[PDB]
Design a protein around this ligand. Structure first.
Ligand SMILES: O=P(O)(O)OC[C@H]1O[C@](O)(COP(=O)(O)O)[C@@H](O)[C@@H]1O
Ligand SMILES: O=P(O)(O)OC[C@H]1O[C@](O)(COP(=O)(O)O)[C@@H](O)[C@@H]1O
Ligand SMILES: O=P(O)(O)OC[C@H]1O[C@](O)(COP(=O)(O)O)[C@@H](O)[C@@H]1O
Lengths: 529, 529, 532
């Protein structure tokens, strides 16, 4: 390091947690972390924002995008087709409003989140108080579908009496209320309230440690997916995936016409956790859906499942998302808690490709500030990653490969470490080439230049890929068309402030048109032309 | 491992995250973590609970102690001597209520938390609304000491006009309200409200990135410390330590008569962080006081300072405490958020010796449940620690030593790993011998048998030390007195459920009476006598 | 390593590939396998000393086929014209193969300096009179020139004048392969009053060593100044500078090679304790190092030499400069067809230690099996090269090497990392000076670094760097520079194909630059070997 410190300035090595990057143990790494060491890199951890009343206006979205939202989540657990279709128009209006200047345009992906195997309570309307210590009944009786009170809950899962056990829990409304079952019979269940809040009407029920007969996709889901194809969505977040076949069902539904759509299976319960490896293998990636997961399993165990699934997805090289209550208190407050700040940082340090806002952006008072807070924590945490260890462990775990794109990608990432490259610039049609760079977690941003609008959107799922959408039509000479895409990477980089004159860039390209021929790594100096 | 699996049962190696313990990389470690793998060990991370209205009754304390409170924190920022003196009696009444049965008696330490260099607002009384966008004034004018409104704040730091800068912040009431200074003059400051809540009367002010002339100990502090000596407290949490001399001031105050009291310096601001190494060297340990720290420094950087200080304290072998908002939402709610759960786990995985509750126990609706939730997260996180790496890194970092107690301690911890010892049993007068075991972070509990009531209390600061207070008077033959203290460790272990017949224990003792002669490690089977 | 399905079960049996996949060095050792056959590409260079048994053009030709890469001219013996006869003989043997330039093996020529000598005077006149000395004795070492010929059993004179000053009371005086030791007792005006320790027979003008003494001689005799200038005249690739002791001795050789010899590669020979102590400063200003174990194992205890060897190979590996292991590697083979079990072991362990080259002295120069010596070193080195634990070596070198903004450095480590991901048969590099190939060498890839060059000198000099197989390209530039680049690469690959280094469906990493002239290497491509 003594020589770049005479060339790049003493202060270059004070930023990006570079003193901590050069440590020889994880422990020493931790000791050298410095609050005055400023993140300089662009932010690599994608932000996912749930659209709802607080974030659906075209002007709201424009501020979200400016703040750093990369992916928009449509939760089909609430709202009609036309409501969502309008969310989509407003998002594409906001996004496409920056097309004016191609060099600074930010692709925004749109993720459709399924309703999935849901269990709802009755019309019970307004609201009624439920009391801890107190005896509540659960019935499947179609007459009570319309009645309901502090003493009786109806629920639309007919066979509930066949699946629970004595001492098992029934949780209603995102786990707000807890009932312990004491007696099972064919008429219904007899329950004591363990946790008593105020019950609304047609709420969500969870039954931990049960096998519920509800099939892969409800009729409602089949429809919701065909909407997504019709509206050209980029990603499905598949709710409550329990086994592989559940993911295959989803793929079949999307059929030939939506085979390029990414399936992110949400692990929400003990079944998904247990069947995780088989879910991973057929999904495009994973969401640690900590909300359902923290009622389906004991709450003090969610961190184990989080770190497990993130690790296995890092090892598999498929994107993984951390979700739910990351900045919960910013629903009502403008500044998050010390534990929220911690949780966002620890999700990045764990190895998450994406972090997610729900309430915070859908309904809260501070949607834009939440996005801004995730963006600011993420940048700090990314630079505090111990790349030495991480890269070496990924290097080792990864199999040998005779695939030129794999070979090229690992040489390029190594190269970027050797010189502290400001960027790896890569041409990709499908995103694949950038993904294989991303899977080694380089410090250097992976600037992916593509003509596929859809690719530019989907690559937000892979940590460290900055998609640039290329709009100009083919030069006549292919080699020229290549240079210009590369030159567009650089100029965009310059304008967006990720690259400056004198920076080194690694440039990854291929020897002919089409997917699958990336085979070339160059080392260039950014220049003034 | 194939042989203990034929001896101890296949299922022994399914618990304590033992499959993950046997992994060869950190990454693989993470992948093997298992939500069905049950923590079996006792909980090693001490819990600190702030005493206040919700946790001051003798009956409340008894449930706190049962739930797992190890250290009681008296916050001298609120309350009079007689109020606190009564907190102390109630704590000692609760604690000493279990002396009935020596084999299950749990020492409870009492920590005195200083008021420290405080800056307070005026009598302003009741409450008044302060508004974002709006022009507020700060004055030192003794006339306004009694007035105050949505347009004027008084504050008792006379020289405030001499220490701030334009664009600097003034934060009032645990950072509830934020003012940006725009004009400085000798009469006062002119400020815009950035963050507007509701102001009370005589609240706390923070001035980030300023040097305030306020001396080491205020007059009030001198007194508060002499109370602590008089009331036999175990620990000082020294508020807002800024430099070493601040810690020496505290030690001088306690004078000869309180030289065995432990000083834990609270790092709350950019000055303490910068001067951390020199603070550590003279303190007995550290508190990451994330509350003040998250307003004194940018909030998105607290995790860097946390992980830094925890690492440096692990490396130094001195206790370190993580504090503030760990389970904040349990002030009003019975179940914490997914990020609170995360934060507690990540503080244990970071290497914290102690975790802390404030609001959650002092004033909230759910004091006992908060303690129970910290206890349950901590147990899970402790077993998910990657001991392979951690022990090796501590082994390496630690200097060579010709001190027999150091030598013995590292052999013993190695030994405990070889056999998955249920416990290391150690005789200590002062606690030192158990501390040097603790500093290598064994999986096996360090059961410390002592006659010093005060030691039994203070060793709660060191991760993994379970103090047992020994009450029987000296056998005539010293060797016999040793065996019996050791036999008391075992029986206590048996009764409390940390040891069973057939378990291996490492037993650490010394060759003569007095501190400093620990030099002996034995390997024993727990027996039926 | 599940890919096995495409390259065959067979592939992961060979090259010590199971031992390469071990997580620990101990597991690595455990998985070493005598049935796991090595590749043809042998990456550690053989320096053969040229003397009586290795001068015949027929023998040189055999020695080249056996796998000799550098030819050492020991200028301690032989005449200028003797040597020019050797040089011309070598060139003839080398150039006899230029006829098929796809299998042409460049052969470097190294000039081994005579350097600071210290000789004993004549014994009572006669040049074959052989005194004896008794152990518990008294002996005298003199400056005085009349004793030159008056050489008693009690008194001897020696070339080196300034011993009075430089050897102190207690210093040791070894004579003839350290057969005779003297502990210096008194620094008299007479000379040095010594006490014998070991004894035996004598002669006149036989080597003497000054253990732990800082030799006064300038580090270039007049004979060196003259041998060097001859070296420049005959276009030698490499100097082995004898008895290097400090940095100034290396600069003295660079000074004496002058502007005409700027591109001669200087390998400082570490022969003595002062050498070992000043090693780092010597290494800063040299292009490499010889571990000259002959003289070293007299000038320091024999049991300490493996320590000096291992330290110097490690420090050179760290610096990324070649290092030679020299002396008695196959001693027995002078007289016998086959080596001892300690000799093969010594060769394998030099390679596992990290030696860029291994040397044969008498085994090739004056001995009865020079061709089979070469063949032995060649066979052991291929087996030992595969038993290297690259996972740990590559990891340590990576971590030890500094960050660089030099695109050649950057490209190189990228290429080496790529080679490892896919078990590349080769890294094909274009280089004018050798530098681009050396910068690959430094990371010790398992794949052969096939260096394509038009520089005949570079192609020869590059044998110093482990794993670099030089090819000489003769064709004149194509019209279009890009077509000229591609033709060199193709030469590289077809050259490989002919020699067995490469087979169709192998991956290669191809390293090249963006424009002509040195220092512009900046491109790495992954390609398949073609013409299925
Ligand atoms: O990442 P993917 O989808 O394989 O795309 C990589 C491809 O992009 C290119 O660089 C350029 O291809 P196009 O000119 O066909 O867009 C190819 O050379 C390479 O194979
Ligand atoms: O941990 P410390 O304070 O050094 O105490 C260790 C001491 O305790 C003992 O085991 C027993 O000492 P006492 O019998 O004096 O309590 C000593 O042998 C040993 O030196
Ligand atoms: O190894 P060196 O001395 O830097 O030589 C490397 C040079 O070889 C090349 O591949 C070809 O250059 P030439 O055509 O000058 O031989 C250059 O692009 C590159 O800079």
């Amino acid at each position: 390091v003594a020589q770049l410190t005479q060339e790049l300035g003493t202060a270059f090595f004070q930023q990006q947690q570079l003193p901590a990057a050069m440590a020889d143990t994880f422990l020493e790494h931790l000791c050298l972390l410095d609050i005055d060491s400023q993140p300089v890199a662009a932010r690599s951890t994608s932000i996912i924002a749930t659209i709802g009343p607080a974030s659906r206006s075209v002007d709201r979205l424009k501020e979200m995008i400016k703040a750093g939202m990369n992916i928009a989540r449509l939760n089909f657990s609430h709202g009609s087709h036309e409501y969502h279709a309008e969310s989509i128009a407003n998002i594409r209006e906001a996004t496409e409003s920056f097309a004016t200047s191609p060099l600074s345009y930010r692709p925004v992906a749109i993720a459709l989140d399924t309703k999935g195997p849901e269990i709802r309570t009755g019309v019970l309307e307004s609201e009624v108080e439920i009391v801890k210590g107190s005896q509540v009944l659960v019935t499947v009786d179609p007459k009570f579908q319309t009645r309901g009170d502090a003493k009786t809950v109806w629920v639309d899962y007919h066979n509930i009496t066949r699946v629970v056990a004595v001492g098992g829990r029934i949780y209603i409304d995102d786990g707000l209320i807890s009932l312990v079952v004491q007696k099972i019979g064919p008429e219904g269940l007899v329950t004591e309230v363990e946790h008593g809040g105020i019950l609304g009407s047609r709420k969500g029920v969870n039954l931990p440690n049960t096998e519920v007969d509800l099939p892969g996709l409800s009729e409602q889901d089949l429809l919701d997916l065909r909407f997504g194809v019709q509206h050209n969505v980029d990603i499905i977040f598949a709710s409550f995936v329990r086994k592989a076949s559940d993911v295959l069902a989803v793929r079949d539904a999307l059929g030939p016409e939506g085979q390029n759509i990414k399936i992110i299976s949400k692990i929400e319960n003990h079944e998904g956790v247990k069947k995780f490896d088989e879910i991973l293998e057929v999904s495009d990636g994973i969401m640690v859906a900590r909300g359902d997961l923290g009622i389906e399993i004991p709450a003090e165990k969610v961190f184990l499942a989080q770190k497990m699934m993130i690790g296995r997805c890092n090892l598999a090289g498929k994107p993984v998302v951390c979700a739910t209550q990351m900045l919960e208190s910013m629903i009502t407050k403008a500044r998050p808690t010390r534990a929220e700040t911690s949780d966002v940082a620890n999700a990045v340090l764990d190895g998450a490709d994406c972090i997610m806002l729900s309430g915070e952006t859908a309904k809260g008072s501070f949607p834009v500030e939440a996005v801004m807070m995730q963006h600011a924590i993420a940048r700090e945490a990314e630079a505090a990653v111990y790349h030495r260890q991480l890269f070496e462990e990924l290097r080792r775990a990864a199999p040998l490969s005779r695939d030129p794109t794999e070979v090229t990608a690992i040489g390029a990432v190594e190269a970027s470490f050797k010189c502290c490259a400001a960027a790896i610039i890569v041409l990709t049609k499908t995103g694949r080439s950038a993904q294989l760079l991303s899977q080694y977690r380089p410090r250097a941003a992976v600037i992916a230049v593509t003509r596929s609008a859809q690719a530019a959107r989907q690559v937000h799922l892979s940590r460290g890929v900055f998609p640039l959408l290329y709009r100009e039509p083919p030069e006549a000479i292919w080699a020229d068309d290549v240079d210009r895409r590369v030159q567009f990477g650089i100029e965009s980089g310059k304008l967006r402030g990720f690259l400056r004159v004198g920076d080194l860039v690694i440039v990854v390209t291929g020897w002919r048109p089409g997917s699958g021929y990336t085979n070339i790594m160059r080392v260039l100096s950014v220049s003034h032309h």
